[PDB]
From a paper:
A single ER‐localised Fic protein, [name] ([name]), catalyses both [name] and [name] of [name]. [name] is a class II Fic protein (with its αinh N‐terminal to its Fic domain) and an ER‐localised type II, single‐pass transmembrane protein, with a short cytoplasmic portion and a large luminal‐facing catalytic domain (Worby et al, 2009; Bunney et al, 2014). We report on the transition of [name] from a dimeric enzyme, that deAMPylates [name], to a monomer with potent [name] activity. Mechanistically, monomerisation relieves a repressive effect allosterically propagated from the dimer interface to the inhibitory Glu234, thereby permitting [name]‐competent binding of [name].
The crystal structure of dimeric [name] suggests the existence of a hydrogen‐bond network, involving the side chains of Lys256 and Glu242, linking the dimer interface with the enzyme's active site, impinging on the [name]‐inhibiting Glu234. Mutation of the dimer relay residue Lys256 does not result in large conformational changes in [name]. (ii) The dimeric dimer relay mutant FICDK256A displays a clear [name] density up to and including the γ‐phosphate phosphorous atom. As noted in other Fic AMPylases, this Mg2+ was coordinated by the α‐ and β‐phosphates of ATP/AMPPNP and Asp367 of the Fic motif (Xiao et al, 2010; Bunney et al, 2014; Khater & Mohanty, 2015b). By contrast, in the active sites of FICDK256A or FICDL258D [name] and MgAMPPNP assumed [name]‐competent conformations: their α‐phosphates were in the canonical position, as defined by [name]‐active Fic proteins lacking inhibitory glutamates (Xiao et al, 2010; Engel et al, 2012; Goepfert et al, 2013; Bunney et al, 2014). As a result, in‐line nucleophilic attack into the α‐β‐phosphoanhydride bond of ATP would not be sterically hindered and the Nε2 of His363 would be well positioned for general base catalysis (and EV4C and D). Concordantly, the RMSD of ATP between the wild‐type [name] and monomeric FICDL258D was 2.17 Å (and 2.23 Å for FICDK256A's ATP). The disparities in the manner of [name]‐ATP binding are well explained by a monomerisation‐induced increase in Glu234 flexibility (mediated by weakening of the dimer relay), as reflected in the lower melting temperatures of FICDK256A and FICDL258D relative to the wild‐type dimer and localised B‐factor increases in their respective crystal structures.
Numbering used by the authors:
A (entry chain A), B (entry chain A): 103 to 436
Amino acid sequence: SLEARAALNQALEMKRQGKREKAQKLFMHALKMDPDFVDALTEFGIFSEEDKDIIQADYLYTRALTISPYHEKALVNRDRTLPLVEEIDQRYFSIIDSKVKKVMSIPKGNSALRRVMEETYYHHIYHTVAIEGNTLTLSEIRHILETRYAVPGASLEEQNEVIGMHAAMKYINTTLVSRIGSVTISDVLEIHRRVLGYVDPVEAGRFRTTQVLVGHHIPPHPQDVEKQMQEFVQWLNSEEAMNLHPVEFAALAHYKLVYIHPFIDGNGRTSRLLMNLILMQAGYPPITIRKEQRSDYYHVLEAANEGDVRPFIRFIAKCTETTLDTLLFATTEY
Amino acid sequence: SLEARAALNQALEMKRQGKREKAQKLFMHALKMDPDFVDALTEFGIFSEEDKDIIQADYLYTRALTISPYHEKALVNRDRTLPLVEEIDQRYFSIIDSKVKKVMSIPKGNSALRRVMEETYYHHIYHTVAIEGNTLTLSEIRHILETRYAVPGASLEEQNEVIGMHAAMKYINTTLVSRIGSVTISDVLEIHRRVLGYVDPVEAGRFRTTQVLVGHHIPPHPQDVEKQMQEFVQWLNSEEAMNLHPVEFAALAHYKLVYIHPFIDGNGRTSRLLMNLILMQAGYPPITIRKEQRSDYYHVLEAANEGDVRPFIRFIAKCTETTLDTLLFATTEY
Ligand SMILES: Nc1ncnc2c1ncn2[C@@H]1O[C@H](COP(=O)(O)OP(=O)(O)OP(=O)(O)O)[C@@H](O)[C@H]1O
Ligand SMILES: Nc1ncnc2c1ncn2[C@@H]1O[C@H](COP(=O)(O)OP(=O)(O)OP(=O)(O)O)[C@@H](O)[C@H]1O
Ligand SMILES: [Mg+2]
Ligand SMILES: [Mg+2]
């Protein structure tokens, strides 16, 4: 492409000109033009290291080698950054584990903690539906679940989504948390049943029969969905997956489920519930993917489809840390 | 019982005294005291004939013989009334068939008719939920189904019941009406699924596992429910049932289903939908059991349990006629 090289050649000049803005947009626009443009990736990676964003740099070098495996400028930079980010990632998970041990060391009966867990429960439901486009407020959700009376000027669908979540959550907490290691299709179906039961009871708790598009992702064909779910379940209960880091295992479980997209709707909600199940079985608190992180959440998912899950694994880890911060703040406060 | 005979002996005296009130209450109160009091039944039957209520009289004579088969006063009166009401019942069904032929003779495309069918559709849903204790108005139901937005100050359950009905009705009309003669368990499950899906998706479309009380009726034990439903389906598709009068067949189908009470909730609604299916397959319009007829509806059901279904069959026939009157009034008007 002619216009692809134009933007990149314009980008380098601005960088070495001494731009205050830094012409980061010029680089982004180049890869907007052609995202598989090996030269634009490496040079953008080099630019990222100067701003001390080595993880972003490594991502770009990794993406370049999937396109052009024997691109030398990528290969030499990759070999340097490959083990460096491996360390940085490991170090981050140690920082998580430390904050988790602080939370785990607290006794369950602690009165200050249980206040926070009660308040943050309503927040959990808000964010998982809000990220879909649910327009219900926190106080509205509080009113719906406690009173069981509909709020004025809001679709019954949106209000049924809230009830579906609370049902699914109470089910998980009651039944599924107590059994560590072994999970089945039936378990996933029973979560989804309650998630999408009050909205669409016909399709609730069974696989889709039609092919769909999820953002920019094309999941396995309905005929292949069962086969994929059969493999997904095997992976969950495999020794490999047990030996993975809880946060990492929780993340990979999330992605794999939304990748398969076995249901017509409610795949994200159920995946995030399954994510939080995995964590709570491993002794971690249930984490929140906030409403505000929608764009980022989609970008890292898109990145995972193109063949690098690490950004998504980091995103889940970012959320985990943010949760642990919130709990330790409120618990220490009260 | 001493107090049972007291009221009855008091009743006869008042009747033959020449009471303007007629001491009908004295007779009712006697059978309130003891409903299996053979002497009170026969004498109340005799009293009913004087007011030209021979069907009511026959009922009482029939109830007496289940208790005391060889009670002479009942036996002689029964033998007289037995064929008389048989004629009266047959004559009523002829009066129905005539009014049905007037309705059936109208072309489907008729513009005046389709106005009525559209308006009365919302009435159908109102009455079937209103009779349960649903507190939604006609305009509220109209708003819920058209806008799909919840009305202010009404339980989500009540509003989900409305959506459940509309779903079940649209399903029946689309799928089930086109196949005359053959119905399965799966079909009944698929109706109930949509009826109770939006309220309780967990229990929607499957048999209850717990024994319950329905008014004053004890249905078959959960273990026996499947066996009863298996027999119920056989009866529906039997030649006997095809040769029954549509209104009668529709009625018996209703009662048999609510008798079995296979689901935890939503047995009446589904039964009334199945009732109206049977009618529409036989070429009759779907009929309405009004909200106001709740007490009567329960009394005739209780009577059917004690071992005389005829009152219920008449009640359904009464509703059918009332429907046919409403249609022919509105159709002729417009
Ligand atoms: N590019 C992508 N690749 C894989 N999965 C994706 C991608 N984009 C989005 N997803 C996932 O698919 C979900 C959308 O599918 P679906 O509508 O079945 O889920 P939902 O639960 O209805 O929506 P939400 O999770 O927002 O409530 C998203 O929530 C997300 O988790
Ligand atoms: N004595 C009785 N014997 C047999 N069946 C009865 C008796 N009394 C009531 N019923 C039936 O059982 C139904 C009640 O059971 P259930 O609650 O499962 O039905 P529902 O659909 O939830 O209630 P409704 O029909 O009022 O909406 C009544 O609607 C009626 O049709
Ligand atoms: Mg969705
Ligand atoms: Mg009920």
